[PDB]
Amino acid sequence: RVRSITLGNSTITTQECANVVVGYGVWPEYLKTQPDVATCRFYTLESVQWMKNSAGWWWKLPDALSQMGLFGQNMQYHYLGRTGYTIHVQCNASKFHQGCLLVVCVPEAEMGCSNLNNTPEFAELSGGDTARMFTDTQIGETNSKKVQTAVWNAGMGVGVGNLTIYPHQWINLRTNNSATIVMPYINSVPMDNMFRHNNLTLMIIPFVPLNYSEGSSPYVPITVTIAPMCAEYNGLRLA
Amino acid sequence: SRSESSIENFLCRAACVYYATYTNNSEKGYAEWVINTRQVAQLRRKLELFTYLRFDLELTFVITSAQQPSTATSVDAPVQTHQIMYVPPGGPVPTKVTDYAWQTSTNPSVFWTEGNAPPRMSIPFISIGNAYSCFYDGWTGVYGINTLNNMGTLYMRHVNEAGQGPIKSTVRIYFKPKHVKAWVPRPPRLCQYEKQKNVNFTPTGVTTTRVGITT
Amino acid sequence: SRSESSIENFLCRAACVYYATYTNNSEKGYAEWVINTRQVAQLRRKLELFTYLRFDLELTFVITSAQQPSTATSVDAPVQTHQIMYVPPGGPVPTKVTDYAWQTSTNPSVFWTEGNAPPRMSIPFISIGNAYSCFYDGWTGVYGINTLNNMGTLYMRHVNEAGQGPIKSTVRIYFKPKHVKAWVPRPPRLCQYEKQKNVNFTPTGVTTTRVGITT
Amino acid sequence: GLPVMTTPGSTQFLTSDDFQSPSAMPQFDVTPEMQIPGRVNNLMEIAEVDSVVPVNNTEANVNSLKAYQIPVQSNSDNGKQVFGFPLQPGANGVLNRTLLGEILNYYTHWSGSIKLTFMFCGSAMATGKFLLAYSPPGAGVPKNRKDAMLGTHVIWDVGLQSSCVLCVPWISQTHYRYVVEDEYTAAGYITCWYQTNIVVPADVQSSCDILCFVSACNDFSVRMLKDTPFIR
Amino acid sequence: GLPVMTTPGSTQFLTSDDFQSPSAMPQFDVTPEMQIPGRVNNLMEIAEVDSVVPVNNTEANVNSLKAYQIPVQSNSDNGKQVFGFPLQPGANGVLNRTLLGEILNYYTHWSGSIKLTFMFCGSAMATGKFLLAYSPPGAGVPKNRKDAMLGTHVIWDVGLQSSCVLCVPWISQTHYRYVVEDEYTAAGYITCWYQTNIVVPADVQSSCDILCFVSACNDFSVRMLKDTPFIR
Amino acid sequence: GLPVMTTPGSTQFLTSDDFQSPSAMPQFDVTPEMQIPGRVNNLMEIAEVDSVVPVNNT
C-alpha cells in the first residue's frame, strides 16, 4: 500500500508499511521564541547517482537547506534558531540490482583535515544542497584544507562499522529501498546560530557495492527529502 | 553486577593529567596549566565516547621539593609553603612570581605547607551552556573550538622567599570528574590522536589482520 | 539566580590587604598594620558603593620564613613560633620586640608555630557607633576622619630567640568581612584614588570616547 | 581517643573556605544595630536605578556635561540620524560607566533586558517627530529613515510626550547568561532619526537637547564576581 | 577539646578515595541542567548496539569497506567453507574493534552471550542455502559440511530470509565472569558452509556479499575497569 | 572547626589494631560466595578429630 503525505504545498508518496527510526526515542518538540509553520514542507534535494565505484555521500543539515525557500530566508533573517528534522531517503532500483546502504544521521560530526596542522574549509566541509562524496582512497597530506574523506574512517577517525551507534537505517536492495529517520533537536544550548554550526550530518555509505548485470541500468538514484520539524527562532520586537 | 559499567563508575577515577616544575629563584618560577580534558589520551578517549558531558571537578595536588646545588656553607631552609591559585575563565592571569594576579580576591587560592595532607579543591560546572561539548561541528573563525568549554587555569608558586639555596618543586595535578552525565554515544576513537587541539587523524586500518577469511 | 549579587556574596571574600617582613636580629624586627579598608583600591571601591557598613572581621595570616646568610659552620634552627597580637582601639602599642605591650593580657594574641594550618582570629563590630562610615562630611580639626572607625592594630614578631643565623619572615594578612550590612548606596568611584586618607581626586572624563554620536 | 582520619586538604587555607573561627574578643558585647534608612540587600537594586547615559562621547565632551546632551536642531533636509550606539552594557563606552554598567563590570556573565528612557528637553512650544529604531543582533544598523521604519521602531512625538521608554529584549544564544565583555559578536543597536523637522514658533530656540537614561528592566541577573577593570 | 586518635592512613592520598572536598567556587550558582536527548546511564547500552563485524580482515582489505564484506559466489563443487572465526570478543581481531569489543577491552572480566546477525546482500532473485555452525569450546572446528551439520547448526535459506540471528551461549568454567583477554584457551568457533550453490536467473550477478553484525544478547556484564590497549 | 584533642597513641601503628581502612578498589563488586562443603568455624573442630598416635617412636 502507498501512503501520500502532504506538507504545505508539497506532497510525497511512501510505502504505507515503511519503518521509521526515531532518533533517540524523542520526537521533535518546541522549546518548553517565534515559530514558523510555512517552513513545514518537504525539501527534495537533487538526487545522486549510486554507482559501482561510489564511496558515499554526506550533507550537513542546517547548511543543506540554506538556499531553500523560507527556511533559508529565516536562516539569514533570524540570528538564532532551533529545529528538528524528518529525513526520507529513497532508492529507485529494480529487483535485478543488488547493494546495501547505511543511512545514518550523526550529531556534531566534526571532521578532520588532510593536513594534520590545519582544519577543513567551509566549502570542503559542506556543499549546501550539493552532496559531499567520501573517497575510497586516502587524501594526501600535501593538500592543505581538505577533509580526510577515507570512507573506512568516515572522516572522524573512527571505525565506519561502528556508525550504527548513531540513529541509522539499513537499505538492503533485495529487502527494502527507503529509510526514514526522525531526528530531534540535539545541542548543548537551547538555541544556536544556524549559519556557523551544523548540528547534524546525514551520511549514506554503501557497505555492499552496487552490482548488476550488463543491460540493467548502470546507476541507482538516491533521493533525499528533508522536512524541518518544530522550527522556531528568536523574536525581533521590543518588550 | 553491571554496576561497574555505569557512567559514574566509568569516569569517576582520579588521574594525573599534568606535571610541572618551578624553582624559587627565577622570577619565572611558576607552573601553569589550562584545565582541559584533552591532555591525556586515555582520559580523552574515555570522555569522547559521548558528545555532551556535565561534571564537577575534583583536583588533588601532589607537591614535592628537592634541594638544588648551592655554595652556602650551611643550608637550613624552613618548611616550604606553596600557593595554588585557580583563575576562573576571564580572570586575571599572572606573568611573574611577583604579580598582582596572585592577590586577586576573586581568584580562589589554596595556601598549603609541606608535610601535611595534599591540598584539594573542587570546581563546579562553570559553563554558560548546559553541558560541555567534546565535539563541535562549527566555527566560533576557527573550526571546532567551542569557547563555551573554558574551565579556567591553575597556577602554582612558592610562597617562601628564597633562602641560602634554591629549591625546585614539582607538582602533580590529579583530575577526577564527579557526578558525570553523558549524552549521545559516539564510536570509540580508532586512529591515534595527532593534535591536542583538533580531531585530525591519519587513516588507519579498521582492525588487525589475519591470513584468510577462514583463519 | 540573583543570589551572587547580594551584599554578603559581594563583600564576603578573603583578600590579601597587607604584606610585611620582619627579621629576628634587629630589635625592630616586628610588623605592624593599622586595620583599615582603604589599603586596597579594589576592596575600597567595593565598600564605597555604600555609605554605612556593619560587618565582622575574619583574619587569616600566611607566615613564611627564609634563611638569611650567616657565618656559622652549621645552622640547625628549630621550628619557629610567631606571635600575632591584636591591639584593640586605645590599647598599648609596642615599639620594640622586647616591650611590655607584647604581654598585655587585654591585647588578645595568637601563638602559632610553623608547619601547621595558618592561624585565624575574628574581631566583631567594635565601634561605639551603630555602623562604620566610609564617608564623613564633617570634622572631628581634620575634615572627614570620623575616629569612630578605628578597628585596632595588628602586630607580629618572632617568639624564638635568634639562633646561629638570622631568620626573615613575611606575613600576608587576609581580610574578610562577615555578616555585612550596607546602607545608602553611592555612585561608584570614577576617578583614580590619589590618597589613602582622603577622597581627593584629579578630574577625569565621564567615560571613554568614540569618534561621533552616530559611532 | 575516638579514631579519626585526616582527609586530603585538612590543613590547607582555601581563600573561599567557610569555617567557624575563634573570636579574638569574646565577651566584648557589640553596639546594638539601629534602623538606618536605605538598607541594601542586593546590588541589583542599584542596577535597576535609572542613570544618565553619556551618548555624546565626543572626546571634546567627556570632560563636561555635554557628554549627556544629544543635540537636536532644525535641519534643512530630513531623515538624518540623531544618534546611535551598540547595545553592549559593559563593554562599549556609552553604557560602560553608568550605574548598570558599573555593576555589570563586576561580573563575567549577565542576563536580562535593558530599559532605555529618552527625555526631550526643548521648549514647551517645540513640536516634531522622532523615529526610535531597535536593530536586533545580527541585523545591521539602518541606513535610512525608511529602513529604520521597516524594522522594529516607535514614532516619538515630542509635541505630545516629553519622554519615551523602550525595554530592549534579551535575545541570546539560548545561553540564559551571556558574557559581560564580548568579542566581535552580534551586538544589536538603537538609533534615532528625524521623522520631521523641529517646528518652532517665533522667539523660541529651535536647537534643543535630549537626555537618555538606562536601567535594568526585566529579570536581570549576574554571575561569577570578578575584579572591575576600571581600577588601576 | 574532644579527645581523638588518628588511625593509620590519616594524611594519605589514595587515588580511589571518596571524601568530601571544599568547593573553590562556593556561591557560583551553576547553569540549570536541560533535557538533552540520548542520555547514557551505562556503557552496556553501548555494548548492546549492533555493529558491523570486519570478518574479511585480509590485510589488503582492512583499509577499505571490503573488510566487512563476506564474498559469496557460485562454486563448481559444493561444501566449501564461506568463513569462520573464533568467538573471542576482545582478543581475536574480527570482534576486537566492534562496539562490543571496544567496551570489553576496557575491563578484565566479562560475562554474557554474543548475538550474531548475518544479512544476505545479494539480489532478490538469488536463492541458496547456507549452513551456519557453532562449535562449543573444546570441540574442534568442523572440516566438512557433514561434520558441521552433525553439530549445532542452522540451515539458512537466503531465498526465504535475508537475515539470520544466532545467540551463542555463555558456557564458561562455572566462573560467571571470564577474562576479556585469554591464553591458548578453548575458544569456540562459528563457521559457514555452502549447503547448496547460489542459484541465479539470467542477467543477475551470482557473486554476492554477506554482512555480519555483533552485539551482547543476554545478561552481559563487565568487571575491573582497566586501560584500553588500543591507545598508544 | 570543631575543637578536638589528640590523645597519646594517635598516629601509632599497633599491629593488633582494629580500625576501618580505605578500600583500594571501591566499586569492584566481588564474586558472590558459593556453598562449599566442609566449612570450618573453629580450630577445635579439627582438634576433636581422632588421629593415629605414633606410640612406637623408636
Q: 3-state secondary structure string, chain C?
A: CHHHHEHHHHHCCCEEEEEEEEECCCCCCEEEEECCCCCCHHHHHHHCCEEEEEEEEEEEEEEEEEECCCCCCCCCCCCCEEEEEEECCCCCCCCCCCCHHHHCCCCCEEEEECCCCCCEEEECCCCCCCCEECCCCCECCCECCCHHHCCCEEEEEECCCCCCCCEEEEEEEEEEEEEEEEEEECCCCCCCCCCCCCCCCCCCCCCCCCCCCCC
D186: chain A residues, CB-CB within 8 Å = 79
Q: What is the DSSP letter of B191?
A: S
Q: Which of C151, C190, C205 is nearest to C39 (CA)?
A: C151
φ, ψ of residue E100 to 5 degrees: the values are: -65, -45
D183: CB partners within 8 A, 6+ apart = none
Location of C-alpha cell 581517643: D1
C-beta separation of D126 from D154 below 8 A:
no
C-alpha neighbours within 13 Å on the C-beta side of residue B106: 25
φ, ψ of residue B46 to 5 degrees: the values are: -65, -35
φ, ψ of residue D45 to 5 degrees: the values are: -60, -40
Terminal Cα distance for chain D, rounded: 54
Q: What is the DSSP letter of A152?
A: G
Shortest Cα distance, chain B CAs vs residue D4, angstroms = 14
CB burial string D4-15: b at 16+ within 10 A, e below? ebbbbbbbbbbb
- Cα→Cα distances C137→C46, C127, E101, Å: 20, 18, 78
C-beta separation of E94 from A159 below 8 A:
no
Location of C-alpha cell 572522524: A156
Rounded Cα distance, C5 and D53, in Å? 23
Location of C-alpha cell 591584636: C86
Helical segments of A17-113, H only: 61-64, 69-77
List gaps in chain D by the residue before each (C–N > 2.5 Å): none
The chains found to touch E (3+ Cβ pairs under 8 angstroms) are A, B, C, D, F
Q: 3-state secondary structure string, D43-108?
A: HHHHHCCCEECCCCCCCCCCCCHHHHCEEECCCCCCCCEEEEEECCCCCCCCCCCCHHHHHHCCEE
A201: chain B residues, CB-CB within 8 Å = 137
Q: What is the DSSP letter of A221?
A: E
Q: Helix or strand or coil: residue D151?
A: coil
Location of C-alpha cell 573556605: D17
E10: region left, alpha or beta (phi > 0 left; psi from -120 to 50 alpha): alpha
Cell numbers found for residue E86: 573464533
Mode of pairing for the β-strands spanning B109-113 and D13-14: antiparallel
Residue type (1 letter), D189: Y
Q: Which of B123, B187, B121 is nearest to B150 (CA)?
A: B123
Among B7, B51, B120, B207, most E C-beta atoms within 10 A, so best to mutate, is: B207
Rounded Cα distance, A202 and A60, in Å? 6
Among D154, D173, D220, most A C-beta atoms within 10 A, so best to mutate, is: D173
For C32, other C-beta atoms within 10 Å of its C-beta total: 17
The chains found to touch D (3+ Cβ pairs under 8 angstroms) are A, B, C, E, F
C-beta separation of A79 from D138 below 8 A:
yes
Query: D62: which strand partners?
Result: none
Cell numbers found for residue C56: 565582622
Location of C-alpha cell 564527579: B178
Location of C-alpha cell 563541535: B136
C-beta separation of D17 from F21 below 8 A:
no
H or E, element range at B137 = none
C116: chain B residues, CB-CB within 8 Å = 113
CB contact under 8 A, A239 and D173: no
- Cα→Cα distances D132→B127, B205, D144, D191, Å: 36, 63, 12, 6
Rounded Cα distance, C134 and D46, in Å? 18
The answer to whether residue F25 neighbours chain D at the CB level (below 8 Å) is no
C-beta separation of C171 from C32 below 8 A:
no
Q: What is the DSSP letter of B170?
A: E
Rounded Cα distance, B159 and E57, in Å? 60
DSSP E strands, chain A:
2-7, 10-15, 20-22, 34-35, 43-44, 48-50, 57-60, 81-91, 98-107, 132-133, 168-172, 178-183, 200-211, 220-233
- Helices then strands, counting H and E runs in chain F, come out as 1, 1
Rounded Cα distance, B54 and B31, in Å? 27
For E7, other C-beta atoms within 10 Å of its C-beta total: 18
φ, ψ of residue C190 to 5 degrees: the values are: -110, -45
E14: chain D residues, CB-CB within 8 Å = none
Determination technique used: cryo-EM
φ, ψ of residue A51 to 5 degrees: the values are: -120, 180
CB contact under 8 A, D25 and C54: no
Strand order in the sheet with E221-225: E178-179, E107-111, E221-225
Cell numbers found for residue A96: 535485478
Closest chain B CA to residue E191: B214
Cell numbers found for residue A166: 548513531
The chains found to touch C (3+ Cβ pairs under 8 angstroms) are B, D, E
Query: D117: which strand partners?
Result: D165, D213
Residue type (1 letter), A168: H
Rounded Cα distance, C42 and D231, in Å? 7
Rounded Cα distance, E220 and A59, in Å? 37
E81: CB partners within 8 A, 6+ apart = B214, E191, E192, E193
Burial of F13 (0-12, 13-18, 19+ CB in 10 A): exposed
Rounded Cα distance, D67 and E70, in Å? 80
Chains A and C touch (3+ CB pairs under 8 A): no
Query: Taking the mean position of all CA atoms in its chain, how far away is CA E209?
Result: 20
B124: chain C residues, CB-CB within 8 Å = none
What is the widest separation between alpha-carbon atoms in chain E? 98
| E32, E42, E68: residue with CB nearest B7 | E42
Query: Taking the mean position of all CA atoms in its chain, how far away is CA B112?
Result: 19
Residue type (1 letter), A187: N
A57: CB partners within 8 A, 6+ apart = A48, A131, A132, A133, A134, A203, A204, A222
Apex C188 CA angle, C182 and C191, nearest 5:
140
C-beta separation of A200 from A105 below 8 A:
yes
| D1, D19, D20: residue with CB nearest F7 | D1
D231: chain C residues, CB-CB within 8 Å = 41-42, 45, 192
- Cα→Cα distances D120→C197, D160, D212, Å: 42, 11, 9
Closest chain B CA to residue E95: B207
E183: CB partners within 8 A, 6+ apart = none
Mode of pairing for the β-strands spanning F4-6 and E2-6: parallel
In chain B, which residues touch F (CB < 8 A)?
A: 1, 3-4, 9
Q: 3-state secondary structure string, C78-130?
A: CCCEEEEEEECCCCCCCCCCCCHHHHCCCCCEEEEECCCCCCEEEECCCCCCC
**DSSP character string of E148-195:** HHHSEEEEEETTT-SEEEEEE----SS-SSEESS-SS----EEEEEES
Rounded Cα distance, A230 and A236, in Å? 19
Rounded Cα distance, B86 and D224, in Å? 13
Apex E158 CA angle, E157 and E161, nearest 5:
85
Q: Helix or strand or coil: residue A125?
A: helix
φ, ψ of residue A231 to 5 degrees: the values are: -75, 140
Closest chain E CA to residue C8: E27
Cell numbers found for residue D180: 559581560
Mode of pairing for the β-strands spanning A178-183 and A20-22: parallel
Burial of A25 (0-12, 13-18, 19+ CB in 10 A): exposed
